[PDB]
Design a protein around this motif. Structure first.
Motif, short mmCIF file in Angstrom:
data_model
loop_
_atom_site.label_atom_id
_atom_site.label_comp_id
_atom_site.label_asym_id
_atom_site.label_seq_id
_atom_site.Cartn_x
_atom_site.Cartn_y
_atom_site.Cartn_z
N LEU A 1 0.80 -1.21 0.00
CA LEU A 1 0.00 0.00 0.00
C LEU A 1 0.84 1.27 0.00
O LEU A 1 0.27 2.36 0.14
CB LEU A 1 -0.94 0.01 1.20
N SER A 2 2.15 1.17 -0.14
CA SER A 2 2.96 2.37 -0.28
C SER A 2 3.24 2.72 -1.73
O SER A 2 3.92 3.71 -1.99
CB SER A 2 4.28 2.22 0.46
N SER A 3 2.75 1.92 -2.67
CA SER A 3 3.02 2.16 -4.08
C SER A 3 1.84 2.75 -4.82
O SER A 3 1.86 2.79 -6.05
CB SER A 3 3.45 0.87 -4.76
N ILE A 4 0.80 3.19 -4.12
CA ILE A 4 -0.34 3.85 -4.74
C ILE A 4 -0.19 5.33 -4.44
O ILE A 4 -0.55 5.82 -3.38
CB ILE A 4 -1.67 3.28 -4.24
N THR A 5 0.35 6.07 -5.41
CA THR A 5 0.80 7.43 -5.19
C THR A 5 -0.07 8.43 -5.94
O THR A 5 -0.82 8.09 -6.85
CB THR A 5 2.25 7.57 -5.63
N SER A 6 0.05 9.69 -5.53
CA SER A 6 -0.60 10.79 -6.22
C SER A 6 0.36 11.41 -7.23
O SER A 6 1.40 10.83 -7.53
CB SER A 6 -1.08 11.84 -5.23
N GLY A 7 0.01 12.58 -7.77
CA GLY A 7 0.85 13.23 -8.75
C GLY A 7 1.95 14.08 -8.14
O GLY A 7 1.79 14.70 -7.10
N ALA A 8 3.09 14.12 -8.83
CA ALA A 8 4.23 14.87 -8.34
C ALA A 8 4.03 16.36 -8.56
O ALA A 8 3.53 16.79 -9.60
CB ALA A 8 5.51 14.41 -9.04
N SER A 9 4.43 17.16 -7.58
CA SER A 9 4.28 18.60 -7.69
C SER A 9 5.25 19.15 -8.73
O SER A 9 6.14 18.46 -9.21
CB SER A 9 4.52 19.28 -6.35
N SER A 10 5.05 20.42 -9.08
CA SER A 10 5.90 21.07 -10.07
C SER A 10 6.58 22.29 -9.47
O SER A 10 6.01 22.99 -8.64
CB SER A 10 5.08 21.48 -11.29
N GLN C 60 10.31 6.28 -2.92
CA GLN C 60 9.39 6.08 -1.80
C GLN C 60 10.06 6.37 -0.47
O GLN C 60 9.42 6.89 0.44
CB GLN C 60 8.83 4.67 -1.81
N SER C 61 11.34 6.00 -0.32
CA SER C 61 12.03 6.24 0.95
C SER C 61 12.07 7.73 1.26
O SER C 61 11.67 8.18 2.35
CB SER C 61 13.44 5.68 0.87
N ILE C 62 12.55 8.51 0.30
CA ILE C 62 12.57 9.95 0.45
C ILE C 62 11.17 10.47 0.72
O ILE C 62 10.97 11.35 1.57
CB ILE C 62 13.18 10.57 -0.82
N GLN C 63 10.17 9.91 0.04
CA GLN C 63 8.82 10.43 0.19
C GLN C 63 8.27 10.19 1.59
O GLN C 63 7.60 11.06 2.15
CB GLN C 63 7.91 9.81 -0.86
#
Lengths: 50, 49, 99, 198, 48, 49, 48, 50
Positions: A1-10, C60-63
């Protein structure tokens, strides 16, 4: 469940610098206030003695 | 003349002692910390830089 | 003479109030310092993560470290107080009787 | 000195503001038996003898932030009287073979700044062009007019001093490299985000 | 950059020692005079 | 002014020693161990690499 | 484990040294003022 | 004595501004050196291609 991410900021580093600027502005204001307060104490002491 | 109900020299000296107390405190703090700007009260313009 | 002695006691009480105000200012300033240190660390992490020679598992680690540091700021915001007054919210000005 | 930054000068300026305020406070609060002693420039007679007509003179003088000539003292902002922009300045900013010949200044959201200040529209107006001070820095001009006393009170409470029925101008700094130069040929367009500026 | 930052915020350790040693002496000489000041009341008691 | 029931400089200096103490601890450990990353607390991003 | 127990159990020194000094000063002041207070009632005899 | 105090307090800050100037002048030269080292190599290379 740590691999479901949102969008990266700019443009991140600009945002971080803006945040640091805001913090510094507040600290400067507080320092001005304290420097003003100290003179009040000195004045009150002399006045009450007189 | 000779009055005892209030004494005016002691008040002046008590007032005159705090001025030295403050400088003693500042000089003590700088030695232990290791540096000149411990808070924005010292000078705000240099802290940001 | 009655008027003079009426003037004196008020000024002494004014001294006391001013000292309380100075205490309040110092407390707020300490909290601000800690927030600053957290921001500096996040800044460095962000420069670390912008290189093009990294693998998608690394980020992910950094995040997650960034996540913990970000949570810190909110908690310190909403937990600091001085005599029941929350000093890091609500955008108000706070008057002191000094005369 | 010459190696400072624009944002630093604000800090020094606000400290100076507080120091200026203290002088007025002390001037108009000190008293001795209900007589204000640091205003109005009178003299003060004392009876010192057994027959009338025997007095000694003591004279007072008013001390404030205005009678000392320091009214409006300031150390941040433009230097000198702003003027118009000419061809050489456009060439210096963009190049010797440049198209631009005019400037245009707008707001991001119509009537935002007057909303933030707290006074009715028509009391705040914006210029339409840019200007330069003595050193080649660009600026934008704003004009504020008050309609009634309470407007003056709110403006002072938020940090601006102004007299009702009188125009006064404040300035805002610009950056020539951030202008928009591709939408309309020969016109550099600036759009201020007045809703969030500090 | 490290040297340029060092010039701005670091202490001296030659001025501070002197300031401390001056303040200590003046702080110490204040109290003896304070003690002297209180005694001057006791003159009047002899009049009785 | 003069109070004896509490002392507020000793608190400050006691507070202010621990900063130096932690730096000394880290510097000592890095010398004996022989390498830089002794625990994930150093930098979690590089240990996996 | 040894480190963790050390944190639970051992005694700081700077705190205790300052507490020693604090407790000594108060004791001395107490004795002096106690003598001062016992001395007070002598003047009653002068009335007679 | 007051007019002496003004001069001492001003000159003390005047001494700091000078160190700021020294720092700026010192910063620029380090950058200049690498430009020099690159040119010095380009000339040698251009000797070879003749």
């Amino acid at each position: 469940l740590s691999s479901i991410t949102s969008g990266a900021s700019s443009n991140p580093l600009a945002k971080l610098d803006a945040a640091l600027a805001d913090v510094d502005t507040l600290r400067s204001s507080l320092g001005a206030v304290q420097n003003r307060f100290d003179s009040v104490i000195s004045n009150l002491g002399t006045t009450v003695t007189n | 003349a000779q009055v005892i109900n209030t004494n005016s020299l002691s008040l002046m000296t008590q007032n005159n002692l705090n001025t030295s107390q403050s400088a003693l405190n500042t000089a003590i703090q700088r030695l232990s910390s290791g540096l000149r700007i411990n808070s924005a009260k010292d000078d705000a313009a240099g802290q940001a830089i | 003479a009655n008027r003079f002695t009426a003037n004196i006691k008020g000024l002494t009480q004014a001294q006391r109030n001013a000292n309380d105000g100075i205490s309040l200012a110092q407390t707020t300033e300490g909290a601000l310092t800690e927030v600053n240190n957290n921001l500096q660390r996040i800044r460095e992490l962000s420069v670390q993560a912008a290189t093009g020679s990294n693998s998608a598992s690394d980020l992910q680690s950094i995040q997650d470290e960034i996540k913990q540091r970000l949570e810190e700021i909110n908690r310190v915001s909403e937990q600091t107080q001085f005599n029941g007054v929350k000093v890091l919210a609500k955008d108000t000005k706070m008057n002191i009787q000094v005369g | 000195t010459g190696s400072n930054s624009a944002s630093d000068l604000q800090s020094i300026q606000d400290e100076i503001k507080q120091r200026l305020e203290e002088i007025n406070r002390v001037s108009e609060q000190t008293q001795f038996n209900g007589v204000k002693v640091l205003a109005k420039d009178t003299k003060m007679n004392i009876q010192v003898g057994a027959n009338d007509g025997e007095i000694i003179a003591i004279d007072l003088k008013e001390i404030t932030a205005k009678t000392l000539g320091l009214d409006g003292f300031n150390v941040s902002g433009p230097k000198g009287t702003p003027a118009a922009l000419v061809a050489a300045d456009y060439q210096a900013a963009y190049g010797t073979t440049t198209n631009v010949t005019t400037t245009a200044v707008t707001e991001s959201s119509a009537n935002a700044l007057a909303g933030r200040l707290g006074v009715a529209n028509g009391s705040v107006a914006l210029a339409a062009t840019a200007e330069k001070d003595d050193n080649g820095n660009w600026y934008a001009t704003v004009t504020i007019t008050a309609g009634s006393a309470t407007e003056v009170s709110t403006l002072k409470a938020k940090g601006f001093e102004v007299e009702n029925g009188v125009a006064k101008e404040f300035y805002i700094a610009l950056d020539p490299q951030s202008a928009d130069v591709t939408t309309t040929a020969g016109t550099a367009a600036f759009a201020l985000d007045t809703a969030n500026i500090q | 950059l490290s040297a340029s930052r060092s010039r701005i915020q670091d202490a001296d350790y030659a001025t501070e020692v002197s300031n401390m040693t001056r303040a200590q002496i003046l702080q110490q000489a204040g109290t003896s005079v304070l003690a002297q000041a209180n005694q001057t009341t006791q003159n009047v008691l002899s009049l009785l």
